[PDB]
Amino acid sequence: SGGRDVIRCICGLYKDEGLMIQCDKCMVWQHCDCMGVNTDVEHYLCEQCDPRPVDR
């Protein structure tokens, strides 16, 4: 109850590396660099749960 261990990044690369955040909805992990996350965000969401501009 709490775990999930799902690496769903825009990378398309299933790899737990670097600093990763948890998408509040789908409870995945994603690399801060690609999603452009701030780590100090109130609640982070992947581009699937909440479409955000991704220029990578």
Binding site: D16, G18, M20, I21, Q22, Y44
Partner: peptide
């Protein structure tokens, strides 16, 4: 934003 940092290129295995 729960931040789990798992860098595993050279330093990803403690002890």
């Amino acid at each position: 934003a729960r931040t789990k940092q798992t860098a595993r290129k050279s330093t990803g295995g403690k002890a």
